[PDB]
Each structure stands twice: as C-alpha cells, then as structure tokens.
Structure 1
C-alpha cells in the first residue's frame, strides 16, 4: 500500500511539473508573441498606441 501511494504522489507531481514547465511555458510564449504582433500591427496602422484610444 505504501509503495502504491507513493507512485500516485509521483504521478501527480510529474503531471504538475509537465503542466508548469512544459505546457504553460509554451502557451505563454505563443500568447506573448501574438500580443506583440498585434500591438505592432495596429501601432503602424494608427501612428499611436491602440490602447490610448480606448482609454
């Protein structure tokens, strides 16, 4: 029983580490690139920061 539960704990930790170090890092990079590409695109078209117009 102690050995089995230990395996369960290791599986949960591996899952969390996979989510935090692999999955979220990849997703956050894609989000940041997309937000920058977007801000550059509209800054070029509007000659000003797009967010100033919405304030």
Structure 2
C-alpha cells in the first residue's frame, strides 16, 4: 500500500508559489523602479544635450 506524501506535495506547491511570486516581484520591481529610473535619466541626458 504505497502512500503519496500530501505534506511534501503541498510543501513544494507552496514553495513553487513563492518562487512564482519572487519572480513576479523581481520582474515587476524592474518594471516600476529600475527601468523608470533608467529611462528618465537617459531622456533627461538627451534633452539637456
């Protein structure tokens, strides 16, 4: 009578949901803080040039 471990399954499902959330946080931070800092400083250099 082989057992599937429901606590391992739910544990990896939770941790992959936290990987998927970390990837979304990094990827959205890049798309609100970093790229908006970069594209502004670029355009403010070009418009003073």
Q: Specify the TM-score bucket, using the shorter chain as the normaliser.
A: 0.7 to 0.9
Q: Which runs of 5 or more residues in structure 2 are unaligned?
A: 1-11
State how far apart, in whole Å, the 2-side matches of 1:37 and 1:29 are: 12
Q: Which runs of 5 or more residues in structure 1 are unaligned?
A: 39-55
Structure with the bigger percentage of helix: 1
Residue 26 of structure 2 is matched in structure 1 by: 15
Residue 46 of structure 1 is matched in structure 2 by: none
* Greater RCO (Cα-Cα under 8 Å, separation 6 or more): 1
- What CA RMSD, in Å, does the superposition of the two structures yield over aligned residues? 0.4
Give the TM-score normalised by the residue count of structure 2. 0.75
Structure 1 segments, 4+ long, off by >2 Å, are none
Tell whether 2:35 aligns with 1:29: no
